[PDB]
From a paper:
[name] ([name]) is a small (~25 nm diameter) non-enveloped single-stranded DNA virus in the Parvoviridae family (genus Dependoparvovirus). The icosahedral proteinaceous shell is composed of three capsid proteins. These proteins (named [name], VP2 and VP3) share an open reading frame and differ only in their N-terminal residues.
The PKD N-terminal end was disordered and pointing toward the five-fold axis of symmetry. The resolution of the reconstruction is sufficient to distinguish side chains that identify the domain as PKD1. PKD1 binds to [name] near the 3-fold symmetry axis spike, primarily to two of the variable regions (VR) in the [name] sequence that have previously been highlighted, namely VR-VII and a segment containing VR-IX. The C–D and E–F loops in the beta sandwich that makes up PKD1 contain most of the binding interactions. The positively charged R353 guanidinium is extended towards a negatively charged region of the viral surface near [name] E544. Similarly, [name] H351 interacts with a charged region of the [name] surface.
Numbering used by the authors:
A (entry chain A), B (entry chain A), C (entry chain A): 209 to 724
């Protein structure tokens, strides 16, 4: 339309309408001109003594919008309203809007650096709707819409790794290059706006409740089982049985089993002595792939990293966030006091404890001459009639992940939590259209001098979520997420005296309970 | 209606109508007044040297109807008619009826103990249709409708365990209390009756056939494979191949694999020496959960506990029933002569043997200096292209189990056999409405003196089952379940001279065969 | 619309149409960027030796429009036309418009500080229609549309106090943070405008008349009462009566009583000696709240601060304005010559005098041995059959106050005068949308460098008022507000030689009289 008319309005809200809730968020973004308008091939060799660190890829001059964190859509208080009242939820639709664009030209003649706005410049924008480009959004990386609405953010630069050859920096004949200018995009001048809608594919509700019963003790403690059990042999070797009594859960027959587990190492937070001067890496859990060794946090779903009322944590089975945002490439050594360490202790009635052995079993064949022997195991995968709880979602965590296209997968639920999607919300890429400097003669060699500039604008995301109403018959009152602080020095989830947003705790999702 | 009119009739039957069969059972039940009308919080610490035995829960004054045993619906002879002719079956619907109620008041003045009937007293009854209460029915516990129709049974008391804290008797802030009087129930006087219907959710047919072929020998024994195999290296290290010949099953290429296995210990029944003076517990298979060690019979599906024509049994992978019903809390040491030990030997062509190693595999990397080494394994979970047979159903065993609500499970088929249901037949609870004794003054303190009483009545269950017709082209005659006894001293599955029902053998379900 | 077209026109007017009068005001406002775009948590401890001064709250980067002063809508001359002719009035509707916006960018490179206009920048605007935010408008604070139409004003910064803990600067777990960007707002570029309408809820007319009779002397001075009164006891103790004569008002029986009073201290203005070297604070009237002592001017309604034709003023029961506007945070010691001290002397026939005792009453029980004793009181609250006059409204005073939501209040009429409203004219907030400076690299840390800028525009308020026509039968002429000055050196309510607006007197509202 025009220069003196606004292309959209500010919307931040939450509208609860029974079975649905609609969240809206608007933020102000700024977009730098990345790479100075060109593609570069980026690469690395073996860094920090690990060739799993090697890669080969491309950085592009595009930036993208990333809103795959819950705090980008939920306020602390609406999150509390959700986890204290519902049993589950899932995303239904998405609507995005980019508007009020402003391109600024920057000129640094004689160290004066003046910023003027360029009314005729454009930004290009497109969404990759067929998933033809490497999807980098759901991998726990930075650059999402901020938690707090008044914050202004920088869009991150799009880049991707393709195939490297033999754990070195070199490409292979299969490494691909994707040119993003090879997709159709819209061009927007200062009076233009971009709009985009999306519907999620039917996914299972997240389970925002904790189990009120232990999986191995579902039998009625008042009645005995009509099943018996082998309990020994007499002085001659003949077998003897005993009836499974009422409430002797250590012996009853079971119908269901706990989920898969792979033992992780346990460390003590706060009080609780640990081995001094250790170097985690050398002894962490790894998986090999293409000849290299990778750490695999947070480990696959089906375990619990903490046992309620204990300070031992299987740290690599844990999501660890920082209480605040950090600068790029920081190598500082943070301590427990700076972190937001999550705990999955409310799944312990169903998920095995990560730092303990998973059980034991027969190692030999007993005979008149050999005594029965058993041996414990450290890992155990899926068996039939197995049940576990998926990892929890936090307000500061990720909403979805793309399920990789390979044609074969098992139980597509991402290790970091959230929804696993075949076709997730498409990537939205954006860049400042290049504007050439003063060029006076002809050359077949591509132009390399540009006017420096950047853009800024507003972005609105509108998500509809479907809720699963809590339907309990528990008599006594439940546990609820509550604002409880002893002698607060500042309000949590609010700006402090400096104006910086504070958050002292990770807020999970399981407060309500249910009988198994 | 009224005192002198009966509220229902007696129905026991079986109606076969092609693809369906409808069973009806009526029994006479008696209901004691449990706990003297009050809820109690029950609990236990570490019993028998195992804190997996600890719990915290509640007993209620309610009793419930449990008809989750096949012999509650099938006569020995109809069961035989089913397993000798069909390939499978599954439950379709359920209809329950409680009628002809009679409340009796018991007065023990001067050691005379007279029983009179109280025409104005009620029983309360309800079904938990939304599964809001801890479901205790499918956990192999006692108190089901009896096998034999003339038997009168006592309804069991409803109780449940909730969460205990740290393997001790104490509750946690998440432990829940469920008050059952907090549901809507019907009240029945002597002229009233209760009726309830239910439809099962589409489940897979049980497979009542044994495989006529071994899974590893599905190739035609007359033709060779067009695939080759590595057979050695020559004096220089160069690799050599050999064609896979006709009928050399030890080498053919396979497409499918046997199901998951976890080695269990094997013991000899009858003839066959075992290690003398053993104490099973210390070396049985265990799974850890919340810091405690639990035995897990019958182990997960996918194994066979016995090898046909052998007396070695992997006893913990076995369902062991008693030939007769036992008294509550018996600590007697039964011998093989008293038991009904089931055998899954007819799945051996597809399921690995529980007391043997599961296979072996590469442990190193061979080179000119090291010889290839291999190591056996004792457990192996699911892999792709795995096939196994679920555990069999017995006439004296369980029909269904509730699949626990956790949001994540794999292959919901219960270890003890039967159908795994998301929404199983709802629990039916019943209790004698309390009647206060002589109270002459007012008190804010709840009444604690009641008239003692009990009730009795009839209960009819009507189930429709769908059958899968056997469609074989086998030429020679099949194996059938048959009444074969050498010199019977009494008729089996009949009352003896005392009037007590006899059953000398577990009747499984696989007699018919099928080619894989 | 566009850059070269104006978004609205200038309207200043007054249209009298019988029973209604419509006022319109347009002003030019300027809006600074407050706090540099961020929220800050502001707080204070015990200041000036009083912990009632402690608080905890938040300043925001928003500013707001405040038109809750009568002089924002009335000219001195229309005010005179209102108070000389009507008996009352009340507000009926409100219409607001913000237009002709202009955002200016300010750059201070090399001490040149140049101001350019930025055609693409926005201001955000919204009205809090559900009263979800702390309402700070009706609390006698600065920043309203100016009295004189040519004046340009700065919008004040929105801030609020929430709960502090124990009269200290610390918050409590109940202290709330309100993010204003969490409401939906409009964005306006230089061609846009915002419009908003509101209807007041039916309120009682203000009473702009003075009583022509004294409340205790409503009886006809020509007739005696048919009631008698106790006047003494004879030498034996027997009681004696006397008839209440005609016009002896000191004794008649009364039907109605004066309003509530709490004694305030009286000081002499002009001529009239006061105690020398006093420090008011230590002896002013206070109310305790949460453990702290607060001064409570102007005291609750129902008293008169001055007795007509006297120079004694109960200064804390008085509204004291300054003859001119002052700078922020001035600690100057003003003298009577600089003030506009209001007087409520025209309510004296009905309201008790604040610096005098309120009356007296029985303190003992007389008997043959004790003489009747009495004791005066300093405070007396509401009794049944009590009548008083509310405080007057001045041209330089406040129009409305929000009645606090607590569920319980008595006679919601604000101490400072005006209308008390359940749902008052919603707050209108406005801010300059932030525009980021030159950002060249990505960071997850929020942007903190902005282009400095400010905005300006016009604002039009249109209020409809309903009038109550004066309907007197007084014969002789009334008192009227009149422009009377002996030897004027300058015209009052006009700009002086410097161009600054002068106002030498507070203009109340009661000139007309009425018989009680």
């Amino acid at each position: 339309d025009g220069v003196g008319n606004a292309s959209g309005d500010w919307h931040c809200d939450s509208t609860w309408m029974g079975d649905r809730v609609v969240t809206k968020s608007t933020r102000t973004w700024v977009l730098p001109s990345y790479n100075n308008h060109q593609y570069r091939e980026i690469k690395s060799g073996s860094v920090d003594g690990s060739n799993a660190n090697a890669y080969f890829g491309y950085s592009t001059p595009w930036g993208y919008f990333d809103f795959n964190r819950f705090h980008s859509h939920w306020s602390p208080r609406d999150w509390q309203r959700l986890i204290n009242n519902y049993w589950g939820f899932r995303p239904r639709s998405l609507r995005v809007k980019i508007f009020n664009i402003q391109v600024k030209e920057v000129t640094v003649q004689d160290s004066t650096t003046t910023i003027a706005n360029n009314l005729t410049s454009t930004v290009q924008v497109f969404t990759d709707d067929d998933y033809q480009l490497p999807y980098v959004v759901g991998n726990g990386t930075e650059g999402c819409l901020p938690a707090f609405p008044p914050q202004v953010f920088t869009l991150p630069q799009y880049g991707y790794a393709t195939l490297n050859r033999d754990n070195t920096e070199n490409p292979t004949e299969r490494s691909s290059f994707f040119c993003l200018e090879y997709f159709p995009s819209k061009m927007l001048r200062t009076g233009n706006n971009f709009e985009f809608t999306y519907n999620f594919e039917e996914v299972p509700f997240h389970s925002s409740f904790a189990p009120s019963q232990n999986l191995f003790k579902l039998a009625n403690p008042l009645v005995d089982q009509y099943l018996y059990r082998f309990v020994s042999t007499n002085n001659t070797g003949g077998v003897q049985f005993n009836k499974n009594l009422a409430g002797r859960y250590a012996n009853t027959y079971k119908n269901w089993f706990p989920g898969p587990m792979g033992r992780t190492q346990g460390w003590n937070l706060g009080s609780g002595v640990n081995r001094a001067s250790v170097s985690a890496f050398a002894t962490t859990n790894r998986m090999e792939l293409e000849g290299a060794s990778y750490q695999v946090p947070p480990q696959p779903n089906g375990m619990t990293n903490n046992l309620q009322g204990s300070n031992t944590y299987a740290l690599e089975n844990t999501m660890i966030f920082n209480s605040q945002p950090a600068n790029p490439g920081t190598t500082a050594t943070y301590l427990e006091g700076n972190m937001l360490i999550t705990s999955e202790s409310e799944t312990q009635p169903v998920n095995r404890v990560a730092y303990n052995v998973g059980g034991q079993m027969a190692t030999n064949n007993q005979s008149s001459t050999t005594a029965p022997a058993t041996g414990t195991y450290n890992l155990q995968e899926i068996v039939p009639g197995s049940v576990w709880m998926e990892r929890d979602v936090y307000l500061q965590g990720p909403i979805w992940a793309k399920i990789p296209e390979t044609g074969a997968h098992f139980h597509p639920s991402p290790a970091m939590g959230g929804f696993g999607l075949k076709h997730p919300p498409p990537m939205m890429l954006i860049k400042n259209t290049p504007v050439p400097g003063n060029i006076t003669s002809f050359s077949d060699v591509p132009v390399s001098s540009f006017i420096t500039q950047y853009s800024t604008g507003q972005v609105t995301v509108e998500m509809e979520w479907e809720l699963k109403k809590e339907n309990s018959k528990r008599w006594n009152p439940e546990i609820q997420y509550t604002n409880n602080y002893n002698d607060p020095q500042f309000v949590d989830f609010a700006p402090d005296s400096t104006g910086e947003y504070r958050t002292t705790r990770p807020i999970g999702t399981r407060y309500l309970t249910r009988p198994l």
